[PDB]
Amino acid sequence: MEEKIIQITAGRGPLECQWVVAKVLKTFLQEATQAGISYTILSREEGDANLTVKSVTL
RNA sequence: UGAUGGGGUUAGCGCAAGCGAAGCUCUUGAUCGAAGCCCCGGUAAACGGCGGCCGUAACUAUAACGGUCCUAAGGUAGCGA
């Protein structure tokens, strides 16, 4: 068994990048569920609007 | 309560194994037989009991929601380390 830590970030990117971090996160979890890798969130970095995330650590 | 049935006895009859009248007596328990119980409803300010699992919301989180399993019904208001 392996445990790892990864971060998905918008860097210095604009709000669109801040938003795609969220969409990519949702897809990433919707794949981790089928892969059987349990996922937990350590630091969700909410973005500059609704529904945005600057970065999230899994 | 005592119907039938099966015995025990013996007057008689039998070469004689045996049959057995009536009476008496032993046993059997047909029929009758109410409550109760089973049965059918009521009743919890009667004694009492008052559920599981799983998923689910433009972001993560939670589940308003949904699926099926069971129950007699799944803890209402209110309160809650």
Ligand SMILES: [Mg+2]
């Ligand atoms: Mg999602």
Ligand SMILES: [Mg+2]
């Ligand atoms: Mg009632």
Ligand SMILES: [Mg+2]
């Ligand atoms: Mg309540």
Ligand SMILES: [Mg+2]
């Ligand atoms: Mg305390």
